[PDB]
Amino acid sequence: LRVQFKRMSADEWARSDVILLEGEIGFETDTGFAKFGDGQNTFSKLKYLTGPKGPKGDTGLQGKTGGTGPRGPAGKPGTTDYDQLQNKPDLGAFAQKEETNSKITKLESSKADKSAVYSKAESKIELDKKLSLTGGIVTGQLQFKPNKSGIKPSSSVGGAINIDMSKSEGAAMVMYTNKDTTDGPLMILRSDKDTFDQSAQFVDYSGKTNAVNIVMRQPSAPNFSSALNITSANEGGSAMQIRGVEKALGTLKITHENPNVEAKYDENAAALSIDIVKKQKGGKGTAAQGIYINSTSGTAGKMLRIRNKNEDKFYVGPDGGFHSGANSTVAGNLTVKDPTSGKHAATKDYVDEKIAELKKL
Amino acid sequence: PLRVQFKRMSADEWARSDVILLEGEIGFETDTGFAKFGDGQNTFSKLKYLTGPKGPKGDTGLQGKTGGTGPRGPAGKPGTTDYDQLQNKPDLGAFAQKEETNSKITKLESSKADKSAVYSKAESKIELDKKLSLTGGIVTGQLQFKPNKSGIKPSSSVGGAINIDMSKSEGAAMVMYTNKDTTDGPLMILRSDKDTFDQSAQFVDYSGKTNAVNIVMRQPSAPNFSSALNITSANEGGSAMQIRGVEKAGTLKITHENPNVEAKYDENAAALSIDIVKKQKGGKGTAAQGIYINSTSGTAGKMLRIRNKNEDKFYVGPDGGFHSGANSTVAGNLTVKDPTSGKHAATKDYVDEKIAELKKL
Amino acid sequence: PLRVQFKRMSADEWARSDVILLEGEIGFETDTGFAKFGDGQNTFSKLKYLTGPKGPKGDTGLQGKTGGTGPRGPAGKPGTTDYDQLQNKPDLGAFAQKEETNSKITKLESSKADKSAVYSKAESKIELDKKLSLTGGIVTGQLQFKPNKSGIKPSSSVGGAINIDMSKSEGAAMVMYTNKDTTDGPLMILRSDKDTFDQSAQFVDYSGKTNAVNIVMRQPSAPNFSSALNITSANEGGSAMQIRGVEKALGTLKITHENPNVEAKYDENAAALSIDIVKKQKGGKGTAAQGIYINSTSGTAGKMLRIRNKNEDKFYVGPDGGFHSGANSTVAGNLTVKDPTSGKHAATKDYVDEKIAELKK
Ligand SMILES: CC(=O)N[C@@H]1[C@@H](O[C@@H]2O[C@H](C(=O)O)[C@@H](O[C@@H]3O[C@H](CO)[C@@H](O)[C@H](O[C@@H]4O[C@H](C(=O)O)[C@@H](O[C@@H]5O[C@H](CO)[C@@H](O)[C@H](O[C@@H]6O[C@H](C(=O)O)[C@@H](O[C@@H]7O[C@H](CO)[C@@H](O)[C@H](O[C@@H]8OC(C(=O)O)=C[C@H](O)[C@H]8O)[C@H]7NC(C)=O)[C@H](O)[C@H]6O)[C@H]5NC(C)=O)[C@H](O)[C@H]4O)[C@H]3NC(C)=O)[C@H](O)[C@H]2O)[C@H](O)[C@@H](CO)O[C@H]1O
Ligand SMILES: CC(=O)N[C@@H]1[C@@H](O[C@@H]2O[C@H](C(=O)O)[C@@H](O[C@@H]3O[C@H](CO)[C@@H](O)[C@H](O[C@@H]4O[C@H](C(=O)O)[C@@H](O[C@@H]5O[C@H](CO)[C@@H](O)[C@H](O[C@@H]6O[C@H](C(=O)O)[C@@H](O[C@@H]7O[C@H](CO)[C@@H](O)[C@H](O[C@@H]8OC(C(=O)O)=C[C@H](O)[C@H]8O)[C@H]7NC(C)=O)[C@H](O)[C@H]6O)[C@H]5NC(C)=O)[C@H](O)[C@H]4O)[C@H]3NC(C)=O)[C@H](O)[C@H]2O)[C@H](O)[C@@H](CO)O[C@H]1O
Ligand SMILES: CC(=O)N[C@@H]1[C@@H](O[C@@H]2O[C@H](C(=O)O)[C@@H](O[C@@H]3O[C@H](CO)[C@@H](O)[C@H](O[C@@H]4O[C@H](C(=O)O)[C@@H](O[C@@H]5O[C@H](CO)[C@@H](O)[C@H](O[C@@H]6O[C@H](C(=O)O)[C@@H](O[C@@H]7O[C@H](CO)[C@@H](O)[C@H](O[C@@H]8OC(C(=O)O)=C[C@H](O)[C@H]8O)[C@H]7NC(C)=O)[C@H](O)[C@H]6O)[C@H]5NC(C)=O)[C@H](O)[C@H]4O)[C@H]3NC(C)=O)[C@H](O)[C@H]2O)[C@H](O)[C@@H](CO)O[C@H]1O
Ligand SMILES: CC(=O)N[C@@H]1[C@@H](O[C@@H]2O[C@H](C(=O)O)[C@@H](O[C@@H]3O[C@H](CO)[C@@H](O)[C@H](O[C@@H]4OC(C(=O)O)=C[C@H](O)[C@H]4O)[C@H]3NC(C)=O)[C@H](O)[C@H]2O)[C@H](O)[C@@H](CO)O[C@H]1O
Ligand SMILES: CC(=O)N[C@@H]1[C@@H](O[C@@H]2O[C@H](C(=O)O)[C@@H](O[C@@H]3O[C@H](CO)[C@@H](O)[C@H](O[C@@H]4OC(C(=O)O)=C[C@H](O)[C@H]4O)[C@H]3NC(C)=O)[C@H](O)[C@H]2O)[C@H](O)[C@@H](CO)O[C@H]1O
């Protein structure tokens, strides 16, 4: 039972009014399409007989893997360290800065600049301008001006200057001059306040010869110059005092040596010369005396004894009675006592009485 | 022309219908127009539709995201590891060696004079000016002399612990001044303590044309008993003073000037005063003499020559015979010789040689 | 009421079957359940199926796996070879410069005072103490004075090669002491060698209240010929010594003789003043010098000589020249007198030849 269906060309159906029954199939001889029938509608307006639709296609494949990445950044640059090097130089053998500048700083502060020290020869040259205790030579004026320095007056250790020769031969001091002339003496002592209760020079001699000795030497031409000259203006005291304790010798010994051999050269020369004068100005005169002999305690010796070649020629005794030597003279009359023995001077009351007592008887 | 109709339902009515299509019989969906065939042993639900083919495969996927950037390579190795090959190597020559330098400094610390061990110029100076100079100075203390085996010569020209030589300089050798109202000692003092001392205390060897030594006491405000020179001796075997002279035409010249204008002020004054005394500490008496004139060689001049206004008034001659001037007196008797001249005193042996020679015849 | 089934084979058997479907006849596959229409002139194998339309395209695929991480970057650049850019560079600042130091050291050795060329503190002192100080000292050698153009003044107030001023200090100016048993010279010595020296050797300008110059010889163990003062002159034209005074009372020169012993007759040969006139020591034939010479160029009214003993007058010469004895005298000769005009006056011979021949009657 091979059944064929109602069929036309695909176009012939569209132009046809033939109505297929509800359930009757209609065919398109072109391409093979087909539809059913709606028993009251033309072929154009009725459903075809297709299937639903196929299922969903498979999901696509998986994409190609991504490209490999880019090269990372370059490494950081190298570093060079001192300590890890080889042949490092030894720094120890180098002088530290601070320690050195400190050593030098202490040196400039602790050491003696040349300009602040005397050299050996500089020290010497300035020393030789100074007196030494082993000797020296002073050319200038050496003044002494003590002041509350406790200078004691002892005649053994004191004095502003003290020379002690008890352990050394020689002299203490010499003052020598070879000058023809000058304008002043050598040594000078002076006190100006008349209340000064002390001496100018003091000599406490113990020894075996002349204590103080003054000598004038024989001059070329003689002239009036004395070896010692004393002068006083104190009217209440003698100009000079001499005391002695001689046993057999004179306390003051004056001697006159003849300058010439011929005996009569020194006929006007004396051993002791006295001259009494008046005031050298307003003076009216003088009643002064020449020689004053006395023995306030009383003597038995002769108050004056003139001699010549050790032979007596004139003397006065303690009684006051003199004894001449040769022929004398009196320019006057001599008052005597009555002659009581064959030699006694004859008065006049003797010559008369014995002239008249021969009253022839 | 047997028009065949087929089995047909609505799309829903098929699912709930029990109609079993025969093996090959067609079934219709009056809705969708879909259709299936038959299994003659199955409901419509279980008969497979007439689906279409499967759709095509989906597009291939995209492409993966690019990979991450790579990692940083390792850091570079250091340059050189030997010191010698480095660049800009420092010049070590410009650095001071340690030992060589500390030795240089040490030689200085040993060769130079610390300040604390040397007097400065000003430190030395202050001690220099405290010492005596040869150009002058001012001594405030006591300058003692104590020579000992120092070769002090005794020469009167160069010796002495002090020697002053003014042969090339005007002025005085030494001056000793005091303006004090009072003190407890003199100025200059000479003293010898060993009574065996065989030398002088002071020696003056003067050669010149004026007074060698000159002593003057000046006029005091109020007079008193003070002498310009005072001599004292306790050596019983020698004179207290010695004077020798060679005067051609007086050896010792004594002069008394009247202190006042009035002629009789000095009425009790003498030029030379003598006194003979006993021992002051138990003396019984004295047999000493006053004045002793002599001429061991023999003189022709007068042993005593008194004058007044240069007019002779009394003199003793070398013969021993005096010669008065005016009227005298004898409180006693004068023994004389028999008168062998027209003048001459009368004895008694010549008054009575004539008083008897006139017998009566 | 007939039900039509269609022509059907297995799905494979159709492809290998020669059956030709009629135009519109449907053919069935007993397998898959598919079916096709007819071509009226085609085998089943070459006939379009009766399916629905094509399914839709599948979903796009997923995204590929992300790419791998990149490769490690290149190595870093190498380290540096310059000293300045090194790491852990040593600090050179702490090192002393060579030249700056060698310059510092050189300047020091030239600017500072080597030890061997300067006296130490102790050497300067040891050499200082050998020099005299102005506050005191002990001179052991000879201190010479040799002034020359030194402006040495001669003033008796400030001048002199040495000048001592004690106006501000108690005590003595100068002391010369000796304790030696014997020596070869005196202490102080003054000497002028040119006999033209027109000035004095020593000068004492004293103002005060006691003895100006004071000389003392002390009692020796054994007495001997030693004088406290000794004058000697060789000038035939000038006195050896000069004394001037202005005394109101007392003698200008006071001589006193004290007996050394208690026995009254111990000093029987001793005098106060001793005079001796002698010749020249080298050939004198004699001398005509005088002993004592009193005169008063101004004229005196007092007595030229007044001898006393126990303060009672015993002999005196007056200004007239008339003496006055005390007791009995003697004349080894004849005494020329005047004719007696009074009863006591001595009688001559022409007075005893007179009153005799007046008895020639
Ligand atoms: C013509 C006529 O007839 N006219 C009549 C008139 O007669 C005349 O009258 C004159 C008149 O007016 O006076 C008269 O002149 C005096 O004659 C006498 C004769 O006896 C003279 O002696 C006197 O001269 C001197 O004058 C002075 C003076 O004026 O001041 C007296 O004073 C003395 O001055 C000196 C100067 O400064 C002093 O130094 C001195 O002091 C003493 O020093 C001693 C000393 O050496 O240090 C002391 O003693 C101890 O000494 C021993 C010595 O060995 C030492 O060892 C001690 O030291 C110790 O010892 C030692 C040691 O040895 O190793 C170690 C220890 O460590 C040490 O400490 C000494 N002591 C100490 C301190 O330690 C002593 O204490 C001091 O005092 C001072 N005094 C003395 C005593 O010397 C002198 O004394 C005196 O001699 C004449 N004066 C004057 C003014 O002229 C004539 O002689 C007459 O003919 C009639 O008088 C009048 C009426 O009466 O009428 C007229 O008409
Ligand atoms: C009243 C009465 O009639 N009473 C009677 C009594 O009479 C009295 O009795 C007295 C008595 O007791 O004797 C009598 O005599 C005098 O008495 C007193 C004292 O006693 C004096 O008036 C006198 O004595 C004088 O003084 C002293 C003294 O006595 O103390 C004598 O001694 C002298 O002392 C000084 C000090 O020490 C000595 O220095 C001196 O020696 C000399 O020194 C010189 C010196 O400068 O040091 C020396 O000259 C240098 O020599 C050398 C050597 O070569 C040369 O080289 C130098 O030259 C220089 O050389 C060089 C060189 O070498 O590089 C470089 C230069 O270019 C160059 O210049 C010389 N220097 C020069 C030239 O510048 C010299 O050699 C030394 O000798 C010492 N003298 C001596 C001799 O040792 C004095 O000599 C003496 O004058 C007594 N005499 C006299 C005439 O007055 C009284 O006259 C009477 O009143 C009766 O006696 C008794 C009897 O019973 O009875 C009574 O009644
Ligand atoms: C046997 C017989 O009968 N004989 C006869 C025989 O005799 C002759 O006659 C005499 C006799 O018969 O006895 C005797 O001869 C003389 O007798 C006198 C007796 O007095 C003797 O003095 C004399 O010796 C002479 O003495 C004088 C003297 O008087 O001093 C000496 O002269 C002086 O010499 C020294 C050495 O050169 C000098 O130092 C001195 O110069 C003066 O010194 C003054 C002073 O005082 O210091 C100074 O004045 C100062 O000046 C200044 C400036 O104005 C002031 O600043 C100072 O003032 C002070 O200033 C201050 C201050 O500045 O802040 C503070 C104060 O407030 C203030 O005051 C002044 N003054 C002071 C205090 O500083 C200055 O330096 C000078 O002016 C000098 N001048 C003086 C003082 O005059 C002589 O050197 C000395 O010779 C006897 N002569 C001799 C040679 O020995 C003899 O026996 C015989 O000559 C007959 O010849 C014969 C004939 O036939 O017959 C016989 O019978
Ligand atoms: C008339 C008469 O005087 N008699 C005759 C005598 O004349 C005097 O003799 C004495 C004499 O030689 O005995 C002498 O005296 C000295 O004469 C001078 C001048 O008159 C006189 O200056 C003397 O004193 C001196 O004075 C001075 C001075 O500078 O002033 C220094 C002397 O140191 C000092 O002595 C005086 N007296 C002395 C002490 O000598 C002199 O001859 C006459 O005055 C005469 O010489 C003889 C003849 O042979 O005959 C007598 O009749
Ligand atoms: C014109 C005349 O001569 N007058 C008669 C007078 O003669 C004088 O007598 C006095 C006297 O005895 O006092 C004598 O005095 C001596 O000389 C002077 C001054 O008097 C003086 O040296 C002495 O007097 C005393 O000396 C002393 C001492 O201790 O020695 C201390 C006193 O300072 C002082 O008062 C004295 N003698 C001595 C030792 O120096 C004087 O020389 C006589 O000329 C006479 O005494 C009377 C009668 O009795 O008559 C007058 O007309």
Side-chain angles (χ1 to χ4, degrees):
Chain A
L1 183 38
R2 285 193 216 182
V3 178
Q4 303 196 95
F5 293 90
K6 189 148 187 58
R7 37 190 168 91
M8 300 293 194
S9 156
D11 307 340
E12 282 181 278
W13 276 109
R15 309 179 163 274
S16 171
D17 56 339
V18 156
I19 277 181
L20 302 194
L21 302 73
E22 179 181 349
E24 190 205 344
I25 278 184
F27 192 52
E28 281 193 342
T29 56
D30 198 331
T31 326
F33 289 106
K35 329 193 201 176
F36 64 86
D38 202 359
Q40 218 267 319
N41 264 87
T42 205
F43 199 77
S44 324
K45 302 276 169 177
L46 39 73
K47 310 281 194 63
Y48 280 84
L49 62 80
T50 70
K53 268 191 185 177
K56 195 182 200 175
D58 307 295
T59 45
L61 292 154
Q62 186 177 7
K64 306 261 165 180
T65 46
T68 320
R71 314 195 78 141
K76 55 192 200 172
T79 279
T80 326
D81 189 12
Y82 187 80
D83 44 25
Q84 295 238 303
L85 278 146
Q86 303 160 354
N87 307 9
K88 293 183 27 205
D90 197 357
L91 303 177
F94 294 96
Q96 295 296 320
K97 188 166 187 178
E98 179 150 21
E99 171 187 14
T100 287
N101 284 7
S102 44
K103 273 181 189 171
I104 299 190
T105 284
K106 266 156 185 303
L107 285 207
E108 182 86 47
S109 43
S110 93
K111 298 281 183 170
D113 306 7
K114 287 188 164 193
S115 68
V117 290
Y118 280 118
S119 75
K120 154 163 168 110
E122 279 169 349
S123 270
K124 180 165 191 62
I125 277 192
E126 306 274 38
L127 281 178
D128 290 8
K129 301 185 174 177
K130 302 293 180 262
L131 174 60
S132 317
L133 295 189
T134 71
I137 301 186
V138 173
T139 76
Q141 165 178 99
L142 172 49
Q143 304 170 136
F144 282 65
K145 306 228 179 210
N147 186 323
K148 279 186 208 178
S149 321
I151 314 281
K152 301 283 167 177
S154 167
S155 76
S156 48
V157 307
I161 299 188
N162 170 285
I163 302 178
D164 191 331
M165 309 281 303
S166 320
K167 315 173 207 68
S168 185
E169 310 209 7
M173 174 155 37
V174 176
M175 304 187 218
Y176 173 112
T177 308
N178 198 6
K179 214 160 177 312
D180 305 342
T181 166
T182 178
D183 56 358
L186 279 204
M187 187 169 66
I188 286 190
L189 313 193
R190 163 164 175 187
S191 187
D192 265 338
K193 299 296 183 181
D194 75 319
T195 49
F196 191 77
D197 71 328
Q198 261 291 347
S199 304
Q201 166 169 4
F202 176 29
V203 178
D204 182 355
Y205 188 81
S206 303
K208 212 204 165 177
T209 173
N210 294 337
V212 178
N213 184 196
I214 302 176
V215 177
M216 171 157 48
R217 305 283 191 174
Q218 175 167 280
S220 51
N223 73 86
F224 192 57
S225 55
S226 294
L228 177 54
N229 164 47
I230 312 306
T231 300
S232 173
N234 175 29
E235 88 179 7
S238 311
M240 187 169 172
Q241 315 201 30
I242 312 192
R243 176 88 60 104
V245 290
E246 289 62 44
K247 182 181 163 187
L249 267 164
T251 286
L252 166 54
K253 170 71 175 277
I254 307 186
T255 294
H256 180 289
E257 171 159 1
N258 200 330
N260 199 327
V261 304
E262 298 175 317
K264 283 188 149 183
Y265 197 52
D266 55 350
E267 61 191 1
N268 292 0
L272 164 61
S273 167
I274 298 194
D275 194 328
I276 305 173
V277 303
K278 55 173 185 172
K279 198 208 180 185
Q280 270 183 351
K281 207 36 174 61
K284 306 168 169 167
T286 173
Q289 314 184 292
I291 298 189
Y292 177 97
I293 309 187
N294 184 0
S295 168
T296 53
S297 162
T299 188
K302 299 172 201 322
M303 316 314 256
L304 164 57
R305 182 177 197 127
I306 310 189
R307 287 195 180 186
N308 201 8
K309 276 187 179 80
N310 300 1
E311 306 283 353
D312 286 10
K313 299 285 186 189
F314 186 102
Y315 73 78
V316 178
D319 46 39
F322 71 98
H323 166 284
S324 169
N327 288 333
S328 306
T329 317
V330 173
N333 295 304
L334 172 54
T335 302
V336 303
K337 279 202 184 181
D338 291 355
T340 50
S341 37
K343 284 322 176 177
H344 292 192
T347 51
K348 176 183 179 263
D349 278 11
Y350 185 82
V351 189
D352 279 338
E353 149 163 346
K354 289 320 174 182
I355 277 289
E357 222 191 14
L358 66 87
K359 69 277 198 191
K360 64 162 165 55
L361 201 50
Chain B
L2 299 197
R3 285 188 314 294
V4 177
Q5 310 193 97
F6 286 111
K7 283 187 194 99
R8 48 189 177 283
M9 302 197 126
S10 67
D12 306 340
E13 282 177 271
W14 268 112
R16 49 174 202 260
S17 172
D18 60 313
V19 157
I20 282 178
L21 302 194
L22 300 75
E23 184 183 15
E25 191 204 342
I26 217 165
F28 273 69
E29 285 192 344
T30 325
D31 196 330
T32 67
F34 291 2
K36 326 193 199 177
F37 282 52
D39 203 359
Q41 192 179 25
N42 261 264
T43 326
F44 190 77
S45 69
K46 311 277 168 177
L47 287 160
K48 308 169 191 164
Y49 274 80
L50 276 181
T51 72
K54 200 185 300 179
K57 203 174 203 173
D59 308 295
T60 325
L62 294 154
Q63 184 174 262
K65 303 184 164 170
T66 46
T69 326
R72 161 162 292 112
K77 290 297 197 174
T80 86
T81 36
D82 187 13
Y83 192 104
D84 196 14
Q85 329 286 336
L86 277 148
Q87 319 309 339
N88 307 10
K89 291 179 298 307
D91 194 356
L92 298 178
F95 286 112
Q97 290 294 319
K98 187 164 188 177
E99 72 165 12
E100 168 186 12
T101 286
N102 285 7
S103 180
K104 275 179 190 171
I105 292 189
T106 284
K107 271 154 188 193
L108 285 207
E109 250 266 359
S110 43
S111 161
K112 302 283 182 172
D114 305 47
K115 287 188 164 193
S116 68
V118 155
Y119 280 120
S120 77
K121 236 161 170 192
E123 281 168 349
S124 269
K125 174 106 189 282
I126 218 164
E127 301 272 38
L128 284 178
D129 289 7
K130 298 189 172 109
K131 301 293 181 92
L132 177 57
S133 315
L134 298 189
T135 70
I138 301 186
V139 173
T140 79
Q142 165 176 99
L143 173 50
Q144 302 172 23
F145 285 65
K146 299 226 178 208
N148 188 323
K149 280 183 77 179
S150 321
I152 315 281
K153 302 277 266 198
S155 167
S156 76
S157 48
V158 308
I162 295 189
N163 172 283
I164 300 178
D165 191 331
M166 309 281 303
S167 320
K168 320 173 212 309
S169 185
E170 312 276 340
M174 171 154 329
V175 177
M176 303 187 217
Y177 184 119
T178 167
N179 202 6
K180 218 159 180 42
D181 305 343
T182 166
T183 176
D184 55 357
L187 279 203
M188 186 168 66
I189 289 188
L190 313 193
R191 163 165 174 188
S192 187
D193 264 337
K194 285 286 154 58
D195 74 319
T196 51
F197 189 67
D198 69 328
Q199 278 293 348
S200 304
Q202 165 171 4
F203 177 31
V204 178
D205 181 353
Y206 180 78
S207 303
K209 295 271 183 189
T210 172
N211 291 338
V213 179
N214 183 14
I215 302 175
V216 175
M217 172 157 62
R218 302 282 192 173
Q219 172 170 352
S221 318
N224 75 276
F225 190 54
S226 55
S227 294
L229 176 53
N230 162 82
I231 311 306
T232 315
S233 173
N235 175 28
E236 88 177 6
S239 311
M241 189 169 173
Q242 314 200 30
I243 312 191
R244 176 169 286 247
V246 290
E247 293 64 43
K248 171 192 181 182
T251 290
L252 167 53
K253 170 73 174 278
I254 306 187
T255 286
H256 182 290
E257 169 158 359
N258 202 331
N260 197 327
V261 305
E262 55 170 302
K264 62 137 174 288
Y265 200 51
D266 57 350
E267 62 192 2
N268 297 359
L272 164 61
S273 166
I274 301 193
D275 195 329
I276 305 172
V277 303
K278 50 176 182 174
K279 199 206 180 54
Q280 268 186 345
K281 274 174 187 174
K284 306 168 169 167
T286 173
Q289 316 184 157
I291 295 190
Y292 179 103
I293 311 187
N294 184 359
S295 168
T296 54
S297 79
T299 190
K302 295 172 199 321
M303 315 314 256
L304 164 57
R305 183 177 198 127
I306 310 189
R307 289 193 183 184
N308 204 11
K309 278 186 88 299
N310 298 3
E311 167 180 342
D312 285 10
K313 299 285 186 189
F314 186 103
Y315 77 80
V316 179
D319 46 39
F322 69 97
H323 163 283
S324 169
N327 291 335
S328 306
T329 317
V330 174
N333 294 303
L334 170 55
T335 302
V336 303
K337 279 202 183 182
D338 285 354
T340 88
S341 176
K343 281 318 179 176
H344 299 193
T347 87
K348 180 233 203 188
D349 277 12
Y350 192 84
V351 165
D352 298 353
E353 177 156 330
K354 286 312 182 63
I355 284 298
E357 214 171 35
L358 49 96
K359 73 283 189 196
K360 284 310 113 202
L361 319 164
Chain C
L2 215 56
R3 282 325 308 153
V4 177
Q5 308 193 97
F6 288 166
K7 190 153 188 112
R8 48 192 181 284
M9 304 195 51
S10 67
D12 308 340
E13 281 174 325
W14 268 110
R16 308 187 162 277
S17 173
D18 56 64
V19 157
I20 327 178
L21 300 194
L22 304 180
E23 259 187 26
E25 186 204 341
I26 289 181
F28 187 51
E29 279 192 340
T30 55
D31 284 343
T32 64
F34 284 113
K36 327 192 199 176
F37 276 100
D39 205 359
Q41 192 178 25
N42 266 265
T43 317
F44 198 76
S45 163
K46 51 198 52 181
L47 282 158
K48 310 168 192 164
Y49 272 87
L50 192 74
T51 71
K54 276 187 188 176
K57 61 174 173 188
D59 308 295
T60 45
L62 301 89
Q63 185 176 7
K65 307 263 165 89
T66 45
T69 326
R72 165 159 294 109
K77 290 188 198 76
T80 89
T81 325
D82 184 11
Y83 188 101
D84 305 340
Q85 282 75 240
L86 276 149
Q87 301 266 331
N88 304 10
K89 297 182 32 206
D91 196 356
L92 301 178
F95 286 8
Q97 294 294 320
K98 180 170 102 168
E99 52 107 4
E100 297 197 9
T101 287
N102 284 7
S103 180
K104 272 182 188 172
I105 275 189
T106 284
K107 271 153 189 193
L108 286 208
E109 186 154 35
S110 43
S111 161
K112 300 283 182 171
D114 302 46
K115 45 141 187 182
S116 68
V118 153
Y119 283 121
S120 75
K121 269 191 170 200
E123 281 174 88
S124 207
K125 177 165 189 212
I126 218 164
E127 302 274 37
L128 279 177
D129 288 7
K130 298 190 172 179
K131 300 293 181 155
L132 175 58
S133 317
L134 299 190
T135 69
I138 300 267
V139 172
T140 78
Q142 168 177 102
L143 173 50
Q144 300 172 323
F145 286 64
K146 301 228 178 286
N148 187 323
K149 280 186 209 177
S150 322
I152 315 281
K153 300 144 284 160
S155 167
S156 76
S157 48
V158 307
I162 296 189
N163 171 282
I164 298 179
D165 189 330
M166 305 279 303
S167 54
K168 321 268 177 188
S169 185
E170 312 275 340
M174 171 154 262
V175 176
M176 303 187 218
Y177 175 108
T178 204
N179 200 5
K180 213 160 177 40
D181 305 343
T182 173
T183 179
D184 55 358
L187 270 48
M188 186 168 66
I189 287 189
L190 314 192
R191 164 162 175 185
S192 187
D193 212 18
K194 286 287 153 58
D195 74 319
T196 50
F197 191 73
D198 71 329
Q199 278 296 348
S200 305
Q202 167 171 5
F203 177 33
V204 178
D205 182 355
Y206 185 78
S207 303
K209 227 73 197 164
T210 172
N211 293 337
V213 177
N214 181 14
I215 300 176
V216 175
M217 170 155 337
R218 305 285 192 175
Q219 175 167 353
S221 295
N224 78 88
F225 188 57
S226 54
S227 294
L229 178 54
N230 164 220
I231 313 307
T232 281
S233 172
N235 172 29
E236 89 177 6
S239 312
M241 186 170 172
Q242 301 187 52
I243 313 192
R244 175 172 285 246
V246 291
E247 287 61 44
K248 182 181 163 188
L250 274 167
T252 288
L253 166 54
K254 169 72 174 277
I255 308 186
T256 302
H257 180 289
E258 170 160 0
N259 198 330
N261 198 327
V262 305
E263 298 300 332
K265 281 187 77 180
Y266 198 53
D267 58 350
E268 64 190 2
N269 299 0
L273 163 61
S274 166
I275 299 193
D276 194 328
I277 306 173
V278 303
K279 59 169 188 170
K280 199 208 180 54
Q281 269 188 44
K282 204 174 175 193
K285 305 169 168 167
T287 173
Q290 318 184 47
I292 297 189
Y293 176 77
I294 310 187
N295 185 359
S296 169
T297 52
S298 161
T300 189
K303 294 172 198 155
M304 313 312 257
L305 162 57
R306 182 176 197 126
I307 309 189
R308 288 193 182 185
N309 203 10
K310 278 187 180 157
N311 301 1
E312 46 168 12
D313 288 11
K314 303 281 188 187
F315 186 100
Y316 71 77
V317 177
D320 46 39
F323 69 81
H324 161 282
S325 169
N328 289 334
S329 306
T330 318
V331 175
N334 293 304
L335 172 56
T336 303
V337 302
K338 281 201 184 181
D339 284 354
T341 79
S342 169
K344 285 321 177 176
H345 297 192
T348 51
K349 174 186 179 264
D350 276 12
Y351 186 83
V352 86
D353 311 348
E354 208 148 20
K355 302 319 186 67
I356 278 299
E358 298 302 291
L359 265 304
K360 199 66 171 180
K361 298 175 181 57

